[PDB]
Amino acid sequence: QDSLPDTKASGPAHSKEVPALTAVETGATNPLAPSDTVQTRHVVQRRSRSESTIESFFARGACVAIIEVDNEQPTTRAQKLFAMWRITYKDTVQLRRKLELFTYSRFDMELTFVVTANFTNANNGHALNQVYQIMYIPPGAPTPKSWDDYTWQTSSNPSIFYTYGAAPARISVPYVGLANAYSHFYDGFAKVPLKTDANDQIGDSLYSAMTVDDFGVLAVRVVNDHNPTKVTSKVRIYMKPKHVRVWCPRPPRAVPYYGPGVDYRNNLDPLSEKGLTTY
Amino acid sequence: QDSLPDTKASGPAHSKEVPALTAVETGATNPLAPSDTVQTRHVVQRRSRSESTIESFFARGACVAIIEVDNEQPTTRAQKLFAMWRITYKDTVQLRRKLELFTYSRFDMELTFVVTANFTNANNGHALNQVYQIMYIPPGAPTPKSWDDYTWQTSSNPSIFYTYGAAPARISVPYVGLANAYSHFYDGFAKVPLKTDANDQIGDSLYSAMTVDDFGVLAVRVVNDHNPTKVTSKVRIYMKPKHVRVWCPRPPRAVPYYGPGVDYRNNLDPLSEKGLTTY
Amino acid sequence: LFCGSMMATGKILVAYAPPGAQPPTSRKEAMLGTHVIWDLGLQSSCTMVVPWISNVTYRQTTQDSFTEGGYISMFYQTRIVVPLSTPKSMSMLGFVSACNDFSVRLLRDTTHISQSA
Amino acid sequence: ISEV
Amino acid sequence: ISEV
Amino acid sequence: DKQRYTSYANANPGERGGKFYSQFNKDNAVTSPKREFCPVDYLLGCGVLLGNAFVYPHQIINLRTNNSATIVLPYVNALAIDSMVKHNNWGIAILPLSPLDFAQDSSVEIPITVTIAPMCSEFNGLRNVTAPKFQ
Amino acid sequence: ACGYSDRVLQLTLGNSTITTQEAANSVVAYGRWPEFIRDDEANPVDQPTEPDVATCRFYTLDTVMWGKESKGWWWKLPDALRDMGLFGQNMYYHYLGRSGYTVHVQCNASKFHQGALGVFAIPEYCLAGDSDKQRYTSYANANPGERGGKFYSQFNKDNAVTSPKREFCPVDYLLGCGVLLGNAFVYPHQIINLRTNNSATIVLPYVNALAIDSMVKHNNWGIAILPLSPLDFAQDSSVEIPITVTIAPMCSEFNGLRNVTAPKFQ
Amino acid sequence: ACGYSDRVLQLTLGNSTITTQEAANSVVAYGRWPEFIRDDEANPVDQPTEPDVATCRFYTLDTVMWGKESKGWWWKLPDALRDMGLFGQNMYYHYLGRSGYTVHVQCNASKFHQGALGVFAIPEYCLAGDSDKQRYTSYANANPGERGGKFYSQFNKDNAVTSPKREFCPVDYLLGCGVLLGNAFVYPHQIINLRTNNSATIVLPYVNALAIDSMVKHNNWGIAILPLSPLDFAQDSSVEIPITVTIAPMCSEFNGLRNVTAPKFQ
Amino acid sequence: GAQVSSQKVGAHENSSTINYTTINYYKDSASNAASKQDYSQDPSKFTEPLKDVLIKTAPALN
Amino acid sequence: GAQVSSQKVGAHENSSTINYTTINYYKDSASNAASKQDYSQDPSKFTEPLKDVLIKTAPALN
Numbered sequence A, B: 001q002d003s004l005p006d007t008k009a010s011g012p013a014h015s016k017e018v019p020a021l022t023a024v025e026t027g028a029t030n031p032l033a034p035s036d037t038v039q040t041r042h043v044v045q046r047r048s049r050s051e052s053t054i055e056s057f058f059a060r061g062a063c064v065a066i067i068e069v070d071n072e073q074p075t076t077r078a079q080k081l082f083a084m085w086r087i088t089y090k091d092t093v094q095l096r097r098k099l100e101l102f103t104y105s106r107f108d109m110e111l112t113f114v115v116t117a118n119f120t121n122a123n124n125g126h127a128l129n130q131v132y133q134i135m136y137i138p139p140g141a142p143t144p145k146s147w148d149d150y151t152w153q154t155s156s157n158p159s160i161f162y163t164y165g166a167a168p169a170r171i172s173v174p175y176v177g178l179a180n181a182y183s184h185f186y187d188g189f190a191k192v193p194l195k196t197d198a199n200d201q202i203g204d205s206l207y208s209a210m211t212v213d214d215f216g217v218l219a220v221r222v223v224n225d226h227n228p229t230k231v232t233s234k235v236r237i238y239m240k241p242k243h244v245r246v247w248c249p250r251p252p253r254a255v256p257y258y259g260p261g262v263d264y265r266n267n268l269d270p271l272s273e274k275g276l277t278t279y
Numbered sequence C: 001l002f003c004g005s006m007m008a009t010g011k012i013l014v015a016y017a018p019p020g021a022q023p024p025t026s027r028k029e030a031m032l033g034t035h036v037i038w039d040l041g042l043q044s045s046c047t048m049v050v051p052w053i054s055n056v057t058y059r060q061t062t063q064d065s066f067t068e069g070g071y072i073s074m075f076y077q078t079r080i081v082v083p084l085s086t087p088k089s090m091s092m093l094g095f096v097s098a099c100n101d102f103s104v105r106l107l108r109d110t111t112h113i114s115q116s117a
Numbered sequence D, E: 001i002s003e004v
Numbered sequence F: 001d002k003q004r005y006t007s008y009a010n011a012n013p014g015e016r017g018g019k020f021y022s023q024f025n026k027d028n029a030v031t032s033p034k035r036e037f038c039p040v041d042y043l044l045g046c047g048v049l050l051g052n053a054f055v056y057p058h059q060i061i062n063l064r065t066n067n068s069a070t071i072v073l074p075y076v077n078a079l080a081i082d083s084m085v086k087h088n089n090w091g092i093a094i095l096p097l098s099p100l101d102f103a104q105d106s107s108v109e110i111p112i113t114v115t116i117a118p119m120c121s122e123f124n125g126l127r128n129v130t131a132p133k134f135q
Numbered sequence G, H: 001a002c003g004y005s006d007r008v009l010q011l012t013l014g015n016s017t018i019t020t021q022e023a024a025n026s027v028v029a030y031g032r033w034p035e036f037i038r039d040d041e042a043n044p045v046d047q048p049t050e051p052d053v054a055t056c057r058f059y060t061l062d063t064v065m066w067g068k069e070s071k072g073w074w075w076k077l078p079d080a081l082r083d084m085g086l087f088g089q090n091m092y093y094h095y096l097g098r099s100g101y102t103v104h105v106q107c108n109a110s111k112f113h114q115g116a117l118g119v120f121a122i123p124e125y126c127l128a129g130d131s132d133k134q135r136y137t138s139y140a141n142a143n144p145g146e147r148g149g150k151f152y153s154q155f156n157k158d159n160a161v162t163s164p165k166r167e168f169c170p171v172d173y174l175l176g177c178g179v180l181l182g183n184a185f186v187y188p189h190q191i192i193n194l195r196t197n198n199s200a201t202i203v204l205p206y207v208n209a210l211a212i213d214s215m216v217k218h219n220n221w222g223i224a225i226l227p228l229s230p231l232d233f234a235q236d237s238s239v240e241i242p243i244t245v246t247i248a249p250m251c252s253e254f255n256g257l258r259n260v261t262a263p264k265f266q
Numbered sequence I, J: 001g002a003q004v005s006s007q008k009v010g011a012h013e014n015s016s017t018i019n020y021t022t023i024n025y026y027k028d029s030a031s032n033a034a035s036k037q038d039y040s041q042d043p044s045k046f047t048e049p050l051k052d053v054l055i056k057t058a059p060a061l062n
């Protein structure tokens, strides 16, 4: 059973015990129930907090990234024959705000990949079904320079080979943090400037940033050789934190996000106008 | 449990036992722990070597081959209506180097086949879905001369019939070596030149090479009769060594590979410049 | 490993500084960190253990200030002293290996090998 | 089985 | 079954 | 405009501390950027609303009720130990929830004094001293 | 008790005895002593020849000179011993042969001499070659016999396409095979550091993917000796001291008897 | 058993380790190991500071050179360590401090070098001065810090009455204090005789008339190093070899905390 | 290795305790689905972080 | 013929020992997946191949 406490029958009172009076200066929230200040009946309470457990609150697949990749003739100017994405929950706002109700977290992660494609131009013949390679490149590993260079050999890096039209691809990732918990906030720096330094660039870091690559990138390409006609594809990544634990609650983000840090720029006015004595 | 040894609390020392001094000439690595040369606290060590077990190190599908095959009208000049590949881990560098950290090995092998295709020309109508035949031809068996000659009858040779668009094909192969272990290195020859020989070509062999065909070939063809319009297809083979055992460790390859043997040709300079007293 | 002649003597200081301060430019600064004063003699070789001292549970294999490991330095504690008719200059060889508490994770491809088109 |  |  | 750009020397006021502002004034001089924090009071200097800051460990000094506040703090971090020079664990924010007022004197001023004690302090990784450039 | 030491050893095999007053202990490769093929690992069904004391004994090869310019020396086994007494005869009269080895490298000098030799025992020591041509080193060149081969400070490609030398070109810092010398220490080894020791003693098991094999077609072990630290003495810029290699076959057995193999070595 | 010796030692305190292959055993001054103030001998009632590994470790002072003309060197404790890391900070932030010490003096040379250093640990090493003026040596001069002081073959009286130097004038054969050097052997000591040993190791207890005292006002021990026999080598009439002094505080404890002492050393 | 638990039955058919069966197919615990049977806790560390926690019928300040 | 083993649980849900089940569907052992439960060994054959292995607090050369 996970039902909430039953309301107790409470009668009139004329006493020296005063639950209604308190002192918020202490730092505590007054633990009152309706029976402390009004006459209450007995209610056998059946309601439950099942849907607000941490797991339940985060148990949903959220869109964290749209990676666009093209399949077309390799010309000699900047193309999209392959694409790379730094893994983060921060390119999107919705999940970012939910996770940020907490300072620290621990969880395994489920990544689900929805892949859509279409024809760019009116017509140059058609395309046979495409297979997509999604390669994870951990910090340190050789990054691709070309859509078909040796890095895609993926001999130790994990790769997914997705076939277009198949059920959306899915993998699970362990708790991979360098610390005992993921820090959603870091009041610090990766480097300290020292008096004995040559330039002062040497000790300069981004405020609140930890490692440079942090979790690595996902490299995406269409394994198919190009058709005459061009096909544009988009990979939508949905992430779900599972087997979650969170520490130290924080106030929700009240004004729009301005990049990876806590910075604000505009629309610093979240609250509507309402008259003090107007219901 | 597979966790590493806990660090022991170690205090000051004034003694005749000197762990810090040794003699590498003996051939041995000095077995020291931090507590042998500094004061240490007690640490209950939870870390583990689970991801560096031989199985874990090789437990990944690596790209060992790209076999290109065409489906088009049988003209009368050199075409690609079928293709053959000598089975080896050596046409690629990434897995080759990992396996070559060891002199001898034993394992079962998992082959996974990713098959992509596309249209060559702007347009001659379209193509109905293709079925690919991948026939293994063991050393000795009749090799195909034509894309549809009797050899493809495959009455005893193993063949895979892959349908385009289906989940990537997969098979497992046993430990098939003539010896009790696969030799990644063979300091020898398949023939000895003798004084009583007629020409000296008779006793000539390639250095480090064992059998001529060694493991045989994979023959690939598109079973479909040709459309008016041409379709080019590529079969990407991913191999994974499973249930692995390895013997005699070797230094990692430090300079670029020059074919199947240990030969080197250029970029014999792997090491960067760095000043002796520069951090 | 000291690969000098047996008649050659000397005392050397080898050290390790955990990250966060100025990298040691003098024996004086180096002395303050983890160190071994090696005395040359019949036992040819000396081992300094770099104890696992870190903030994070696991460091990165890539270069990164957030997960940095510190500095190793070597200095003369006294000096190399030889007699006459003895070579006054010689080589020192160095070796590295991991203590039994060492572990690694998240398998990746190495930057140390590649192949052209 | 483990019936909980 | 063989529970290990 | 520059995100995550506040310099170390500015992020770290030492004993002196920093201050809050009633509104956001963007450091305009692109040529020689001040690289400072601009903490707006009703946004708790970090983009959230002050009224919800009460979910953090806190007390209120209401002058009719009390002289002082006493908060005992554990070490809180994602790690058992860390670089104290690179990273601050706790922040102490003091804000006037209700403004100071006295009789009719429109220019009242009273002192606030902060006293702090380290507890169960332990250190690892000894070597030469860190000398941060604070200029 | 009494006065026994790591430094003082006596090795006796057959009618041969070695004494050393300055050793640095001794290595048993991979922790394995040489042993004979056990019935449950046997493959040729014919009763083996076990020559024992006549072949399992100390054969001393021709001495080499270590000088300031010496880049390194290498040998292959069984090849270095192919002409050594009755071992050689047994090797060539039988299709198959297996044998372990005790390797003893000797180099003395003086309290005032300086330098350090790295002595390595490598399983399957495949070496690199001459040319653009891959896997082209000829049998006669891959097999120097007792003479051994040498190392080079750099790769000189055999240029004469018309009449190719078909030799190995083993570059010292690449261990003659494309890897770095510093990592050669993962192989069974010892170091002769002149201030510390006269010699190296490495006991080798038979290592191969098979219980037994053709000794004429395939070498099992390679002995590579390199100057980790160069030879030096007082001020004499042209110092030279001898290095002598002595090897004993151990637990030697042979299968497949017939007429003798006569390899063309020209 | 195994192979342990008087000559080969390892000393480890905090994150510092010293190895020595040529020692002449080691001395524990007056047979007493360093220990902490016991409750039944305690005097300041306040809970002490015991910095342990951060202060009780090996601080190496600046090296001095021993040459044919060297008359001797001297140091005072705690003064020599006043600027050594966290020990120095603890010393100056507290009115009171007590500490024992491991003293390790280092001087290597060669089988063909010659000479002998007398290393003495003296309780209350009061030194003599400059002048006609008695007990006039200034604080800044009595306290050289890490640098140490030197000895002289004879007494030169500081003559300039108008602006007195206020320094010590320590004559070597009088142990710088009016007694004869030959009797200094009644003090805890060792001898570094170059044919016999590289170093000296003396462990010192806290010695004083009180359980604890002002480290800034009073030095407990003096380390005096003198050439009992002069340095000599082959025929080179200008030989010079280094002497390096390394010291570790032991069982250090402090009382009476307040703001830091900043002594005027100019 | 089958795992069996009781469902919390919300709307009931006109037909008691109902069960569901779970089996983990993968060695890595990360691969597992969510149990969703989770334990709740005291708000106290947040709602009453006091050194001397006082009882609601008594004066908060005494 | 079901095979049951314990997972090494890394991150834990707010919900003990967790299991997984394995069944081999093929006669050839080659067809089998990897157990990944593997035994570790001594570096000794590599790090200390000595005839007379000596103890670290004693002189390497005696």
Ligand SMILES: CCOC(=O)c1ccc(OCCCC2CCN(c3ccc(C)nn3)CC2)cc1
Pocket (backbone or CB within 6 Å): A087, A088, A089, A090, A109, A111, A134, A135, A136, A158, A159, A160, A171, A173, A176, A182, A215, A218
């Ligand atoms: C501040 C940034 O966001 C986070 O804190 C954050 C974000 C994501 C998160 O997941 C871990 C990120 C690394 C994972 C993500 C994706 N991974 C893989 C692995 C293989 C494949 C084919 N595809 N993806 C494996 C590693 C953990 C933390």
Ligand SMILES: CCOC(=O)c1ccc(OCCCC2CCN(c3ccc(C)nn3)CC2)cc1
Pocket (backbone or CB within 6 Å): B087, B088, B089, B090, B109, B111, B134, B135, B136, B158, B159, B160, B171, B173, B176, B182, B215, B218
């Ligand atoms: C030096 C070369 O590489 C190797 O040492 C090496 C490389 C691969 C390896 O696998 C064994 C090779 C033969 C196998 C490979 C493929 N096989 C099959 C069998 C049937 C089908 C349809 N497809 N493939 C069956 C036989 C074993 C050793």
Ligand SMILES: *C(=O)CCCCCCCCCCCCC
Pocket (backbone or CB within 6 Å): D001, E001, I001, I002, I023, I025, J002, J004, J021, J022, J023
């Ligand atoms: C415990 O699980 C033993 C009972 C197993 C009942 C049959 C399970 C069928 C599914 C097995 C999946 C195997 C996955 C490799």
Ligand SMILES: *C(=O)CCCCCCCCCCCCC
Pocket (backbone or CB within 6 Å): E001, J001, J002, J023, J025
């Ligand atoms: C041991 O395995 C007996 C229990 C079997 C439980 C049901 C297994 C269901 C899957 C059977 C696969 C058969 C493959 C031919």
